[PDB]
């Protein structure tokens, strides 16, 4: 019997970047997808958050639209991948919200890699877990997302972000402050926009002749049709903001670092159009009590924002928001403190 922890993500900043093979810079968090699990003949688990037990002989890997799709598609991806594995019989239970938009799936994709990983010896390489996982997500479960999640959930490393080119794959760790939390808020708001906005910055990087947005620069811009050019302009931006994120952490400039992720979230909003209201609201009320910087993390219409705020303040902060926000919005909003930590193990 063995136990594997994997990590949620939050990605900093950089976000709508991965689809035209941008910058991103992702962390682990420490709200986990948990799986206790042995080998068996076929595959067992008992979720916790569903309360209930969902079953599959490993000659059973059609779709039956449920959770257990996540599980039969990694099942997909490794025998399609040349692999052998058998069975496994276990528990999924973890701290990590479901679709609060911290990569739960991601989350549950790579622990029931991992778990196979070490029950069965496959000796996977970090980077081929994540490729397996994405291609699972991709292929099997059929949602088309970019590298980000996946790469987040396995490279983490405690106390760092990961500053990744998607394009090139080539990464590094840059230390996040001592001091300064991610105030996490789930806005209690649990696709079709995103599909929307991939095809069109596809057509743009064909329009523009390149293949990566990160070789597009603002001039060039005025090349693409209006509705293209709205949205690809947000993410030039968006690499730019990127790579000025990652001087200012290499420099210790917290300050500096939350005046652009704020830039960032408005440009979602206004130009890429791709916030809420409930979203909004957290942005804006975090930074009148003190954060450095806010914004929504993830694909966004709904999931959560963060806030960098004084470690000392975080609670008092998410506190007074939430209390405001519910008298405000219907949802069951929560909030949450996270730190940087490492990726899927033990
Ligand atoms: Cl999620």
Redesign the pocket.
């Known amino acids: 019997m063995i136990k594997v922890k994997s990590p949620g993500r939050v990605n900093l900043i950089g976000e709508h970047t991965d689809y035209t093979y941008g910058y991103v810079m992702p962390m682990a968090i420490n709200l986990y997808t948990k799986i206790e699990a042995e080998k068996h003949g076929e595959v067992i688990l008992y979720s916790e958050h569903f309360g209930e037990e969902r079953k599959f002989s490993l000659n059973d890997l059609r779709k039956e639209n449920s959770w257990i799709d996540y599980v039969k598609g990694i099942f997909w991806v490794l025998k399609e991948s040349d692999y052998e594995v058998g069975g496994i019989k276990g528990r999924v239970s973890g701290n990590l919200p479901l679709?609060?938009?911290?990569?739960?799936?991601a989350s549950f994709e790579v622990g029931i890699l991992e778990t196979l990983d070490k029950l069965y010896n496959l000796k996977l390489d970090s980077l081929s877990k994540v490729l397996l996982a994405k291609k699972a997500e991709n292929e099997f479960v059929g949602v088309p997302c970019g590298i980000l999640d996946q790469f987040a959930v396995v490279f983490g490393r405690e106390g760092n972000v990961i500053f990744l080119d998607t394009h090139t794959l080539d990464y590094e760790y840059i230390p996040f402050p001592k001091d300064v939390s991610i105030l996490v808020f789930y806005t209690g708001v649990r696709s079709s926009e995103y599909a929307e906005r991939k095809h069109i910055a596809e057509e743009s990087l064909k329009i523009l002749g390149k293949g990566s947005s990160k070789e597009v620069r603002e001039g060039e811009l005025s090349k693409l049709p209006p509705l293209h050019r709205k949205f690809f302009g947000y993410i030039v931006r968006e690499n730019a903001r990127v790579l000025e994120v990652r001087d200012a952490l290499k420099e210790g400039n917290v300050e500096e670092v939350g005046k652009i992720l704020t830039t960032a979230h408005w440009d979602l909003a206004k130009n890429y159009e791709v916030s809420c209201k409930e979203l909004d609201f957290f942005v804006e009320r975090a930074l009148k009590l003190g954060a450095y910087g806010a914004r929504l993390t993830g694909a966004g219409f709904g999931?959560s924002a963060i806030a960098l705020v004084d470690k000392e303040d975080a609670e008092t902060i998410g506190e007074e928001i939430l209390r405001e926000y519910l008298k405000r919005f219907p949802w069951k909003a929560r909030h949450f403190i996270v730190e940087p930590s490492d990726g899927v193990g033990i």
């Open positions: 679709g609060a938009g911290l990569s739960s799936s999931g």
